[PDB]
Amino acid sequence: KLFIGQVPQPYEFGRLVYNFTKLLSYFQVNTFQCQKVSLTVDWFAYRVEDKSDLLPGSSSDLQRFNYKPTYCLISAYTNLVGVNPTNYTTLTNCYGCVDKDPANPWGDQICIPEFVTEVEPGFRPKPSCARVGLEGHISGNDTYSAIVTNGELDSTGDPIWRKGVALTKQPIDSSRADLAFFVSV
Amino acid sequence: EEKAREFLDKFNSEAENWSHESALASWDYNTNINDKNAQKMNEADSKWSAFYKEHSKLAQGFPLQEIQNSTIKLQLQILQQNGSSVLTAEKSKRLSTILTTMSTIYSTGKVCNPNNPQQCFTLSGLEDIMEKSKDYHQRLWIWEGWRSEVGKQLRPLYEEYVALKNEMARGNNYKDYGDYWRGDYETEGGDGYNYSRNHLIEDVDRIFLEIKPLYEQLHAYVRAKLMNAYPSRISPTGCLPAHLLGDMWGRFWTNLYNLTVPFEKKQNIDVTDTMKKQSWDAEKIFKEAEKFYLSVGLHNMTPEFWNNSMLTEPSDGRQVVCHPTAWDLGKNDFRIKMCTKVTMDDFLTAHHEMGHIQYDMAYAKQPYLLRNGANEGFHEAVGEIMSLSAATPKHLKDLGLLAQNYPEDYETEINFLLKQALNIVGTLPFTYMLEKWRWMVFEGKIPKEQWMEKWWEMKREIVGVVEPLPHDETYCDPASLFHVANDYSFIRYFTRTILEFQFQEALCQIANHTGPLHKCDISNSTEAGKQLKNMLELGKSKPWTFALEQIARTKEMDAKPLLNYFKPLFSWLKELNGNSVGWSA
Numbered sequence: 001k002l003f004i005g006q007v008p009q010p011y012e013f014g015r016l017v018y019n020f021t022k023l024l025s026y027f028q029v030n031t032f033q034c035q036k037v038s039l040t041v042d043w044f045a046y047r048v049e050d051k052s053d054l055l056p057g058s059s060s061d062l063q064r065f066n067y068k069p070t071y072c073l074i075s076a077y078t079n080l081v082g083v084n085p086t087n088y089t090t091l092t093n094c095y096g097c098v099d100k101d102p103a104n105p106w107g108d109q110i111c112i113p114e115f116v117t118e119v120e121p122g123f124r125p126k127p128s129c130a131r132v133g134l135e136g137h138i139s140g141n142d143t144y145s146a147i148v149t150n151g152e153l154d155s156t157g158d159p160i161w162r163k164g165v166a167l168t169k170q171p172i173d174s175s176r177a178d179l180a181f182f183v184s185v
Numbered sequence: 186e187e188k189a190r191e192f193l194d195k196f197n198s199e200a201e202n203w204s205h206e207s208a209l210a211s212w213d214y215n216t217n218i219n220d221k222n223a224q225k226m227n228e229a230d231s232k233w234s235a236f237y238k239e240h241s242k243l244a245q246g247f248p249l250q251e252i253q254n255s256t257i258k259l260q261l262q263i264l265q266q267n268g269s270s271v272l273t274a275e276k277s278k279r280l281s282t283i284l285t286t287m288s289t290i291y292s293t294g295k296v297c298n299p300n301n302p303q304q305c306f307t308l309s310g311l312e313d314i315m316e317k318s319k320d321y322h323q324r325l326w327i328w329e330g331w332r333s334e335v336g337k338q339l340r341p342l343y344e345e346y347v348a349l350k351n352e353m354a355r356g357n358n359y360k361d362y363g364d365y366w367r368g369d370y371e372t373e374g375g376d377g378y379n380y381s382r383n384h385l386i387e388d389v390d391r392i393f394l395e396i397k398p399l400y401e402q403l404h405a406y407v408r409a410k411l412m413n414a415y416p417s418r419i420s421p422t423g424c425l426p427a428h429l430l431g432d433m434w435g436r437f438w439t440n441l442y443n444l445t446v447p448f449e450k451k452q453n454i455d456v457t458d459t460m461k462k463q464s465w466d467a468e469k470i471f472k473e474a475e476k477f478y479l480s481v482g483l484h485n486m487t488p489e490f491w492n493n494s495m496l497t498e499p500s501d502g503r504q505v506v507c508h509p510t511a512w513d514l515g516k517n518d519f520r521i522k523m524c525t526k527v528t529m530d531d532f533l534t535a536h537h538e539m540g541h542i543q544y545d546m547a548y549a550k551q552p553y554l555l556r557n558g559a560n561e562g563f564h565e566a567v568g569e570i571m572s573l574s575a576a577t578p579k580h581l582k583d584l585g586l587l588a589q590n591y592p593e594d595y596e597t598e599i600n601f602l603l604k605q606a607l608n609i610v611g612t613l614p615f616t617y618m619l620e621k622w623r624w625m626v627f628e629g630k631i632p633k634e635q636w637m638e639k640w641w642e643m644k645r646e647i648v649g650v651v652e653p654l655p656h657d658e659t660y661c662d663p664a665s666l667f668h669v670a671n672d673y674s675f676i677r678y679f680t681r682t683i684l685e686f687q688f689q690e691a692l693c694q695i696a697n698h699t700g701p702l703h704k705c706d707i708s709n710s711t712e713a714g715k716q717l718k719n720m721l722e723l724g725k726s727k728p729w730t731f732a733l734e735q736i737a738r739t740k741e742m743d744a745k746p747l748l749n750y751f752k753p754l755f756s757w758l759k760e761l762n763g764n765s766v767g768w769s770a
């Protein structure tokens with residue numbers, strides 16, 4: 001089922017809740033590593049060339065702003081023809097913003113790079129951050145920046161604004177999809 | 186050396202015995218103020234002083250040039266220094282009289298309303314008004330009044346005071362009294378662990394310049410806010426009026442928060458209501474403070490602590506001074522005196538004061554004379570970092586004081602940092618500027634004829650504050666501040682603030698904290714706690730720069746940790762202010 005339709009990006013990773021040999025008949029795995037080993041699978045598109053960012057303990061944007069595993073990793077490629085990604089979009093940054101003029105919760109924002117919005121392990125990026133990724137994947141700017149809000153309110157009932165940076169990379173092999181699968185018991 | 190070793194050993198044994206009796210009598214007084222306890226306090230203090238001076242004179246029989254052991258040399262340096270006695274009987278007595286006189290003038294000062302002589306307030310009343318009122322005229326006549334009623338009386342006394350203290354310092358082989366006060370930092374040793382007195386000047390001047398960029402952003406911001414609060418009173422590119430700074434001296438801008446709050450609709454974190462709903466009391470608050478320290482591998486509070494300490498205001502009719510203080514009485518006897526109420530403010534204070542006890546315990550094993558902090562600013566720095574940690578959203582959530590699902594509001598964090606900046610950053614230019622001025626006055630760089638000319642010139646250039654009304658040289662505004670009139674060293678507040686963040690950042694790095702420093706919680710960080718204890722246990726037996734390295738991995742004071750703490754505020758202020766940052770003088 002996770003190979004049917006399109007493939008979500010790291011900032012919007014999908015979650016769904018067996019025969020491993022059969023799984024390997026769908027995709028070709030390049031890296032198979034396990035930590036400390038009903039089942040839950042978190043999955044998203046991600047390049048093989050930068051596969052190092054999928055490995056735990058690494059310092060990278062993926063595990064900081066898009067998806068951080070909570071503690072097997074299967075890094076594999078396949079032709080879904082589902083469909084294959086045109087490109088790969090990853091949040092390189094995301095941080096909180098506040099309104100310049102307190103009289104207008106929807107007005108011009110001042111963003112603070114230091115208010116780093118961490119993905120938090122096992123959690124999707126906050127919707128303001130995910131929205132930036134969603135827009136960046138379609139905008140076509142190679143790196144897309146935006147200040148957005150997405151239905152999340154603060155303690156008073158005003159919109160929560162965040163600024164994010166979504167960087168889009170082109171694949172070398174455009175005939176295949178590169179996917180990262182995180183499988184836990 | 187061997188004779189000095191036996192001498193100090195004998196001294197230390199008796200010194201603890203006598204100091205303990207002195208401390209006990211003082212404690213009894215403060216927790217039960219009456220004539221009987223006051224008499225015991227005075228007698229016990231007298232016996233202590235007689236003892237200390239007896240051995241101080243005997244210590245002169247042990248030349249430092251004959252000592253190889255750093256521990257012995259250091260203790261002799263403490264007992265040996267004459268201090269006031271290098272003065273003749275007339276000047277020693279005169280200096281004591283002057284110091285008493287200045288203290289009296291300050292504490293009994295009052296200012297009356299020039300438009301209503303029947304309405305007059307004492308210092309305590311004047312402070313309450315200066316810390317609350319939003320009325321331009323009310324604040325102005327009080328600010329000017331205080332300078333006229335008190336500052337003008339202390340002026341001539343401060344002049345004689347400076348002359349006498351400089352002579353005292355020279356009698357102890359110092360250049361001047363400013364040099365004497367810079368003595369506490371000075372240390373000796375090999376490698377890079379030495380520290381000349383002159384180096385303190387270079388460090389505080391270097392640090393201020395590194396801090397300044399942060400302060401300019403805060404200053405321009407407050408200016409913009411006060412311009413609306415007090416229309417047509419403030420110039421858009423000028424300095425702030427001295428009397429509109431939140432208090433009598435412009436030392437802390439905390440009370441400007443109500444006028445300068447970034448996002449008024451947003452409230453800060455206050456768990457007072459929760460503590461009351463959960464039926465917290467003075468004992469529970471201190472017990473939670475203990476748990477915090479234990480989680481990082483520090484020591485238990487002694488059975489004697491819990492039994493002897495005064496954690497509540499007496500209901501037995503006994504009069505006390507509720508001001509929170511930590512005590513070390515010697516002989517492993519530790520106590521805290523604090524009229525604790527069920528509030529967030531006292532919650533954090535309980536953590537603060539217990540931090541002092543933990544430090545006092547850490548070096549309890551050390552020789553009596555070395556049973557102190559590495560420097561004057563180390564004790565409060567240790568206390569403050571524990572308060573910063575205790576106050577985080579994270580710690581409060583884990584204690585069940587702050588709702589677990591309480592949202593991460595960036596506007597609230599800006600309000601928090603702003604409030605903290607008004608208290609911590611706003612005061613740094615003040616402290617730096619004040620000490621810079623005093624040091625120059627004692628040194629002789631600022632002559633009597635230019636005392637106020639330079640005070641206010643420096644206030645405009647360094648702090649960005651301007652005198653509401655022009656002052657001549659009959660004024661002595663610095664003396665209208667408690668710490669100046671009472672002969673205290675004010676630099677400890679500058680160095681404490683800088684060290685406070687060096688300790689917090691270093692401990693947060695050891696604890697593997699990620700993200701903004703102002704959200705760092707060092708609870709359950711036994712690695713950071715061990716690194717902390719390695720510094721605490723040294724007391725002042727080692728060069729303070731050695732003690733610093735043990736925690737901050739550096740031998741110098743560093744501003745960066747502070748700039749990092751307020752970095753998120755800096756960016757916000759910068760984009761909000763644009764190109765109107767800074768001021769003309």
Ligand SMILES: *[C@@H]1O[C@H](CO)[C@@H](O[C@@H]2O[C@H](CO)[C@@H](O[C@@H]3O[C@H](CO)[C@@H](O)[C@H](O)[C@@H]3O)[C@H](O)[C@H]2NC(C)=O)[C@H](O)[C@H]1NC(C)=O
Pocket residue numbers: 086087137138139140141142168
């Ligand atoms: C990554 O791949 C996605 C597709 O999955 C690319 O999104 C597509 O970008 C093109 C070019 O901008 C869009 O066409 C344009 O649409 C606008 C209307 O919004 C129209 O005014 C233009 O004349 C043009 O037709 C296309 O619609 C968009 N795909 C979708 C579904 O919206 C994205 O640009 C690629 N990123 C990079 C860096 O190449």
Ligand SMILES: *[C@@H]1O[C@H](CO)[C@@H](O[C@@H]2O[C@H](CO)[C@@H](O[C@@H]3O[C@H](CO)[C@@H](O)[C@H](O)[C@@H]3O)[C@H](O)[C@H]2NC(C)=O)[C@H](O)[C@H]1NC(C)=O
Pocket residue numbers: 480579580583584706708709
């Ligand atoms: C420092 O470490 C101690 C543990 O040694 C932490 O105390 C513990 O806090 C956790 C929650 O963070 C408690 O677990 C949870 O309990 C609630 C029920 O209240 C339950 O609904 C949750 O599913 C979970 O089981 C844990 O019981 C508690 N331990 C004790 C002894 O009270 C403390 O919070 C840490 N302070 C820190 C990290 O700042």
Ligand SMILES: *[C@@H]1O[C@H](CO)[C@@H](O[C@@H]2O[C@H](CO)[C@@H](O)[C@H](O)[C@H]2NC(C)=O)[C@H](O)[C@H]1NC(C)=O
Pocket residue numbers: 316317318440441443
């Ligand atoms: C800033 O505003 C707060 C309220 O948000 C003031 O605190 C209140 O002061 C009134 C008047 O004394 C008391 O009756 C309230 O109980 C206080 N509220 C709380 C929560 O303490 C505070 O005094 C204001 N500060 C200044 C300088 O004006």
Ligand SMILES: *[C@@H]1O[C@H](CO)[C@@H](O[C@@H]2O[C@H](CO)[C@@H](O)[C@H](O)[C@H]2NC(C)=O)[C@H](O)[C@H]1NC(C)=O
Pocket residue numbers: 245265266267356357358
């Ligand atoms: C503290 O005072 C004592 C005097 O009571 C100083 O001791 C004298 O030191 C000088 C050298 O500067 C010697 O020539 C004298 O013979 C010493 N007199 C006595 C009685 O020992 C002592 O130096 C002073 N301490 C400091 C740091 O100056």
Ligand SMILES: *[C@@H]1O[C@H](CO)[C@@H](O[C@@H]2O[C@H](CO)[C@@H](O)[C@H](O)[C@H]2NC(C)=O)[C@H](O)[C@H]1NC(C)=O
Pocket residue numbers: 379380381384
């Ligand atoms: C620690 O002591 C050394 C000397 O052993 C100090 O280095 C000297 O500093 C002065 C003043 O700048 C220079 O004129 C000398 O040439 C330096 N000598 C050497 C060998 O470098 C050093 O500054 C002291 N450290 C502190 C913090 O005071």
Ligand SMILES: *[C@@H]1O[C@H](CO)[C@@H](O[C@@H]2O[C@H](CO)[C@@H](O)[C@H](O)[C@H]2NC(C)=O)[C@H](O)[C@H]1NC(C)=O
Pocket residue numbers: 695696697712
């Ligand atoms: C803080 O994080 C660092 C990594 O950034 C940790 O250092 C590694 O710790 C593991 C063991 O947990 C060692 O195998 C590595 O060799 C360490 N790397 C380095 C470069 O030191 C460090 O242990 C963490 N500290 C705490 C208290 O968690």
Ligand SMILES: *[C@@H]1O[C@H](CO)[C@@H](O)[C@H](O)[C@H]1NC(C)=O
Pocket residue numbers: 141143144145146
């Ligand atoms: C798109 O790219 C241009 C060129 O680098 C840049 O100036 C612009 O701000 C970018 N827009 C967004 C939304 O990132």
Ligand SMILES: *[C@@H]1O[C@H](CO)[C@@H](O)[C@H](O)[C@H]1NC(C)=O
Pocket residue numbers: 253254255256257
């Ligand atoms: C100095 O004397 C103390 C005893 O008070 C001793 O423990 C220490 O090792 C001695 N240090 C040196 C360098 O001799």
Ligand SMILES: *[C@@H]1O[C@H](CO)[C@@H](O)[C@H](O)[C@H]1NC(C)=O
Pocket residue numbers: 479482483484485
């Ligand atoms: C602190 O007290 C608790 C409770 O008695 C004890 O279990 C713990 O070991 C003590 N910690 C230290 C360092 O003494």
Ligand SMILES: *[C@@H]1O[C@H](CO)[C@@H](O)[C@H](O)[C@H]1NC(C)=O
Pocket residue numbers: 492493
């Ligand atoms: C506290 O100490 C006093 C000392 O006289 C003792 O009388 C009292 O019972 C103690 N309270 C305790 C141990 O709770």
Ligand SMILES: [Zn+2]
Pocket residue numbers: 537538541564565568
């Ligand atoms: Zn304190």
